[PDB]
Amino acid sequence: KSCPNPGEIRNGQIDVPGGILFGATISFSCNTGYKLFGSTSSFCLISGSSVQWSDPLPECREIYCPAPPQIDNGIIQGERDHYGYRQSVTYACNKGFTMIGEHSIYCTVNNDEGEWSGPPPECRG
Amino acid sequence: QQDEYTSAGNVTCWYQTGIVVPAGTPTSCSIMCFVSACNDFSVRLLKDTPFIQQAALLQ
Amino acid sequence: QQDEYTSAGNVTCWYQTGIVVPAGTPTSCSIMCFVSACNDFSVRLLKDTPFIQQAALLQ
Amino acid sequence: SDRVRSITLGNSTITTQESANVVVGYGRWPEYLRDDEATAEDQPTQPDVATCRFYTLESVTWEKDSPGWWWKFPDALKDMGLFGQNMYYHYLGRAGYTIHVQCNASKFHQGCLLVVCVPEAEMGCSTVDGTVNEHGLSEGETAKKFSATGTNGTNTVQSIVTNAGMGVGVGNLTIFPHQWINLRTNNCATIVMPYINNVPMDNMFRHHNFTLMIIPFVPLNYSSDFSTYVPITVTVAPMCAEYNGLRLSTAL
Amino acid sequence: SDRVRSITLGNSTITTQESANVVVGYGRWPEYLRDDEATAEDQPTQPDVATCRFYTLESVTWEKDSPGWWWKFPDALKDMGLFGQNMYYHYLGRAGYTIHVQCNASKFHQGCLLVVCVPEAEMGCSTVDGTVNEHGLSEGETAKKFSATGTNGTNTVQSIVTNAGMGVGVGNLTIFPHQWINLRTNNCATIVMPYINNVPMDNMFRHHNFTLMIIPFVPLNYSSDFSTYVPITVTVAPMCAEYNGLRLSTAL
Amino acid sequence: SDRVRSITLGNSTITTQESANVVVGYGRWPEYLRDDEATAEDQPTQPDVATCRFYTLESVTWEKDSPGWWWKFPDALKDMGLFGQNMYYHYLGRAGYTIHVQCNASKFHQGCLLVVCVPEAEMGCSTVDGTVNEHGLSEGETAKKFSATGTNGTNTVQSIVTNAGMGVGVGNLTIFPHQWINLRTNNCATIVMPYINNVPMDNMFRHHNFTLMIIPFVPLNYSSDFSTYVPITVTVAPMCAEYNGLRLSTAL
């Protein structure tokens, strides 16, 4: 007859276009900024006396950008670890130098991988 | 001496929203329950109690 | 669209006497801030908002 | 004190020793449909007590990082006793509600929840040029969860709390009827919502009259406070339920 | 409750949710100088709001072993906005004050402060046959500190709390207007002092009409109470300030 | 608030800032014996203040596993000032009492005590076919202790709390005048007992008019709450004491 309620994926979504009876397929996706680990779909099948899903719910996992670039003759303000999505790193130039460019860069996600946004600034003497 | 014909149902209790507590206090406690009759309560047909007995005199 | 000519000043906040707390409680918290107009407030001269736009129809 | 308060509907009663006030719709208490506002001509059924009473939904756990939760409304009570049965058997229905959100903690805990009833909370899709699912919208009792980041997936609601699934500033949800549950001062929220719609009655399966959202604005926190478990429970009671257009029951 | 309280002077307002009462001078509310009590003949200036409002002085930290603190008064407000400017430009001045000492902690902290206004608190020297300094007497805002032991040094006040810098029993300072701040019950102290002197008006630089002393009698204490920082803040508001004998400004 | 309360008898006064109510006998306040109820013909002595005042008995310690305690009554006060002296010198006596049990803890402690006055609490022996001792019955001030298990020994009271030394269900002791001390809400219990007996007066050594029992139903508990010491103190005050049949003093 019908498969049990699909449930919910933390930081994800379950699409149920065709009900949850035998033969139905449901689809999984992660929210932007999260990557899917596991299956992306499940089929409702009959196995012996049980009506059950073919595949379990996947995991949606976040992400840290790598250590920020150093700039010549400047300093990263308050450098630390674990720069997650949307966090930013700001720079200042050393005494004797003037900055040109964006003073801050942000951790973004590209293809499931954490990458720093725009180009870091330059310090000129 | 209740039977199914004169059944009265049950009472059950559930957490409506868990027990929350600050640090430094016991994480478990006790709830006590008291019973009493309301003012529309009455009883009829006197009989002996099942609860008391004896095997011989000098009781 | 305020300019210096129609400046209105600033509001700042300071500890008047620090945050004190007993043991077993978090040592840092949050304060939220709400804004609303009083009853002597009014506005004039209708214009479009800077906040919404589009590049093409089927909007 | 005025923190103390009791409410009785049908065979059910709620109590609090730490209430704020009680918010009432847009100042309007529920009422039954008047003859000069009606179109459906058949006699209504007004189950009264069998239907207008407190139903408690399954509780949720407030975690140090919970983004929030929501429930769609006439749907969500669809399996609640006779209120639900009357839904299945009638084409048209109309009701108001007393919503009572419960959450107690301790004088050593802290956190703050916004509790709002949003009329007509049409939600947006995660997949920008796709469309939602009824599943992405509601799961009956239980509750959909907001998310701390942008979501993907076809059919699911774009649920980053920050935009409340509607494309607005979450911090502006206050033009809607609501109360806050600030653990340091308060342990429950009560909102009475009147029927709000652009027609006098409507079908209760096809249209979510309003959405209840519980969004923590200041997160749960505590110390060696051997109480990490802090649940939130929603109890709601239909008020002045009336139904029209009786026929066979709707297909689940 | 009567713990709640608000006070407004000029463009400033103070509030408390945990007050005791309010102490008033020797039962006398400040008043402006009457014609049958005056000698200076020129018209006074009475700045009113520009001058009679709440000025907050720099806070101090209550440590587990703080002996106490003090402030001299008309001097101390000498750099506070127009109250101070009017001081510099006039030979004579007269004012009353609302003093509001603030100190909040937690239901798990303990300690007790005596808050007193001592009229004419002439102080003794550390060096018994020497004389004090204006510096040993007052440092304007900031605050001089009492000491737990006998002090030495020429010019400084013999400040062992025990004798309050005046050669008396500190525990007898209660014949002066005062309140106590007992952390378990109270979080502020409010004293309204009327002008007290043996002449109707006086120069505000040359004469310290009275001294405010905050002396802990039961010391601050607590446990893993991740709050070791417990500040004390003094806010005062001149009342009925009036000035006479206008001329060029005094030399700093 | 009605938590606040004061009581004065003779040269003594009791106060509480956290009382429940005050329970009064079976609704009866103590009164002196009336002429149409008397048999003993001699003039009574009514010491009044010298006798009707608060006597405090030696305190007991509430431990995490204390079963309970009890005291027999006219005996127990037999060495308390003039109340006791009047007992020794007279054949007949009559009195009522205000009983005030005190026990304070903290908002972080928990536990619940039943405080009852049982008129005519005849007790059973441990040795089923043996008889009790006066010692097994009472030790004057001090207090006998209930036990968590069945007891043995000739002469001692079968003191397993569960049957209150009387062969009944301890949880039914509530048909007797009583109050509860629930640490979270309350810090004392006050019961006023009128003279209850089947004769107008009686001998105070030979007959224990009633027994005071303090039985913890929910045990004491706490955490790193540097307060493990939680004492319970009983203070009682005879009311309307009158004595008849004066002669030489009784043999100790």
UniProtKB/Swiss-Prot annotation, chain A:
Q: What happens upon changing S39L?
A: In Dr(a-) antigen
Q: How is it modified after translation?
A: The Ser/Thr-rich domain is heavily O-glycosylated.
Give all cystine bridges in this chain. C3-C44, C30-C60, C65-C107, C93-C123
- Alphabetical keyword list: Blood group antigen, Cell membrane, Complement pathway, Disease variant, Disulfide bond, Glycoprotein, GPI-anchor, Host cell receptor for virus entry, Host-virus interaction, Immunity, Innate immunity, Lipoprotein, Membrane, Receptor, Repeat, Secreted, Signal, Sushi
Quick one: effect of changing R80H? In GUTI(-) antigen
Domain named Sushi: which ranges?
1-62, 63-125
Gene Ontology biological process terms from the UniProt entry: complement activation, classical pathway; innate immune response; negative regulation of complement activation; positive regulation of CD4-positive, alpha-beta T cell activation; positive regulation of CD4-positive, alpha-beta T cell proliferation; positive regulation of cytosolic calcium ion concentration; positive regulation of T cell cytokine production; regulation of complement activation
Q: In which tissues is it expressed?
A: Expressed on the plasma membranes of all cell types that are in intimate contact with plasma complement proteins. It is also found on the surfaces of epithelial cells lining extracellular compartments, and variants of the molecule are present in body fluids and in extracellular matrix.
Q: Which GO terms describe its molecular function?
A: lipid binding; virus receptor activity
> In the UniProt record, which is one GO cellular component term?
extracellular region
The family classification in the record reads:
Belongs to the receptors of complement activation (RCA) family.
Q: How does it assemble?
A: Monomer (major form) and non-disulfide-linked, covalent homodimer (minor form). Interacts with ADGRE5.
Q: What does this protein do?
A: This protein recognizes C4b and C3b fragments that condense with cell-surface hydroxyl or amino groups when nascent C4b and C3b are locally generated during C4 and c3 activation. Interaction of daf with cell-associated C4b and C3b polypeptides interferes with their ability to catalyze the conversion of C2 and factor B to enzymatically active C2a and Bb and thereby prevents the formation of C4b2a and C3bBb, the amplification convertases of the complement cascade. (Microbial infection) Acts as a receptor for Coxsackievirus A21, coxsackieviruses B1, B3 and B5.
Q: What is known of its domains?
A: The first Sushi domain (SCR1) is not necessary for function. SCR2 and SCR4 provide the proper conformation for the active site on SCR3.
Pathological association: Complement hyperactivation, angiopathic thrombosis, and protein-losing enteropathy: An autosomal recessive disease characterized by abdominal pain and diarrhea, primary intestinal lymphangiectasia, edema due to hypoproteinemia, malabsorption, and less frequently, bowel inflammation, recurrent infections, and angiopathic thromboembolic disease. Patients' T lymphocytes show increased complement activation causing surface deposition of complement and the generation of soluble C5a.
Record protein name field = Complement decay-accelerating factor
Native source organism of the sequence = Homo sapiens (Human)
Give the stretch of the parent protein shown, with its full length: 161 to 285 of 381
